Ligand binder design. Sequence first.
Ligand SMILES: CC(=O)N[C@@H]1[C@@H](O)[C@H](O[C@@H]2O[C@H](CO)[C@@H](O[C@@H]3O[C@H](CO)[C@@H](O[C@@H]4O[C@H](CO)[C@@H](O)[C@H](O)[C@H]4NC(C)=O)[C@H](O)[C@H]3NC(C)=O)[C@H](O)[C@H]2NC(C)=O)[C@@H](CO)O[C@H]1O
Length: 273
Amino acid sequence: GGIAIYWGQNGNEGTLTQTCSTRKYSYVNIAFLNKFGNGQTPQINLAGHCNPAAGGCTIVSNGIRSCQIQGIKVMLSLGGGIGSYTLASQADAKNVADYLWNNFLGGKSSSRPLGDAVLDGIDFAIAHGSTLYWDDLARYLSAYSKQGKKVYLTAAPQCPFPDRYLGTALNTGLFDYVWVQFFNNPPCQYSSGNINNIINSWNRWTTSINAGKIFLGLPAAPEAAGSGYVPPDVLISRILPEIKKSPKYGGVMLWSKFYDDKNGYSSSILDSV
Ligand SMILES: CC(=O)N[C@@H]1[C@@H](O)[C@H](O[C@@H]2O[C@H](CO)[C@@H](O[C@@H]3O[C@H](CO)[C@@H](O[C@@H]4O[C@H](CO)[C@@H](O)[C@H](O)[C@H]4NC(C)=O)[C@H](O)[C@H]3NC(C)=O)[C@H](O)[C@H]2NC(C)=O)[C@@H](CO)O[C@H]1O
């Protein structure tokens, strides 16, 4: 399989161009568009990388195309752990979809936050707020594919199945890639000497949802999360041999680029994924 990486939440993790030139990642999620819905003007947060005002982040388009010519798919991640994002109604879902289409996808806008580059898809990292209308947002976005260029749909649900916020949306069967986050969740993450909970959870996910491929989401370093870190050796000799047997296995997802560099996680597991 391949490795999916989240980029954008630490200005010291390097440019998007550097990230893709490592040749270690197959998918890159730009985190995060953490503010939208309920009448709010959508706002993207890329930590210290750039300030979106006055097109301060339009420079990212260079990184996006650079990744894409290498065959790497780039998605804009909605939500994240911090933000006042939500959907107040079905109409709100439509408004946000149209916004995303004109500002990040194949539409037209005179103020595209990240530039004129056209992203491959939208990533759903909804962790709190409203539990409604996310399935509508998925449908409206998916409908734009009929205009020519496919809009990829990906999701990053928490490992407890079913997911309180993305369960309905994932049931639509419209998602291409799903990277389940097997961390910050005691009942389905790794615990020293115990891989039972994570394997049990994996089998539930790979047999319960209709998606293209499912990825094992993990923290790239002990500091990347409150709990759930899996040493590279344990992943390679105990977890991967089991989960790779599933025909739905797509690879591994890591949070995040910044911590991957410090811990050299992807460098240690790349050939085994
Ligand atoms: C897919 C998913 O759901 N992932 C979860 C992660 O979101 C979560 O990791 C934490 O994510 C939040 C964002 O949601 C992130 O917060 C960011 O923190 C950085 C560093 O402090 C801030 O960057 C600064 O921003 C200011 C102004 O914006 C700049 O002036 C300053 O220069 C920046 N500093 C640096 C060093 O760049 C961001 O502003 C802030 N983002 C937001 C939206 O407020 C946390 O840092 C992430 N925590 C960790 C440990 O990475 C993860 C937690 O384990 O869980 C995932 O599931």
